[PDB]
């Protein structure tokens, strides 16, 4: 489905370390962040999304409109300027973050009460699975 609204609690995280290292996150932050629980709260109304990512450590809000490019400065992550664009490919939400790193972005799929998130950077993919609370 296209409807991603909900509070989503992480159940599995595969290769998060490799994706962080591909973004050049400092080693000591990687070791703290690598096995943190994550909750994603998604508020979706038409094209407008408000996504809140929370863990006991860093705590992000990003807001976007599907089909509208936006500047992002990833101040709490690798501290880069990207031009981000979120679109639908059928029922799959696709984000491309254009900038220094190649193949940088993410894709979200919803099956049932499961949200699948694939984060990419370079040759690394991180696969996360969330359950709807």
From Swiss-Prot:
Tissue distribution: Higher expression in adult small intestine and to a much lesser extent in fetal kidney.
PROSITE patterns hit by this protein: FABP (PS00214)
Main location class: cytoplasm
Keyword field: Cytoplasm, Retinol-binding, Transport, Vitamin A
Compartment(s): Cytoplasm
Family according to the record: Belongs to the calycin superfamily. Fatty-acid binding protein (FABP) family.
Role noted for this protein: Intracellular transport of retinol.
Protein name from the UniProt record: Retinol-binding protein 2
């Amino acid at each position: 489905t296209r409807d991603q609204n909900g509070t989503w609690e992480m159940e599995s995280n595969e290769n998060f370390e490799g994706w962080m290292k591909a973004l050049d996150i400092d080693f000591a932050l990687r070791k703290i962040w690598v096995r943190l629980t994550q909750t994603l709260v998604i508020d979706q109304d038409g094209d407008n999304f408000k996504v809140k990512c929370t863990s006991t450590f860093w705590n992000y809000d990003v807001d976007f409109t599907v089909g509208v490019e936006f500047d992002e400065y990833t101040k709490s992550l690798d501290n880069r300027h990207v031009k981000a664009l979120v679109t639908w490919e059928g029922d799959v939400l696709v984000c491309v973050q254009k900038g220094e790193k190649e193949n940088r972005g993410w894709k979200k799929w919803i099956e049932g009460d499961k949200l699948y998130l694939e984060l990419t950077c370079g040759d690394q993919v991180c696969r996360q699975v969330f359950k709807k609370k």
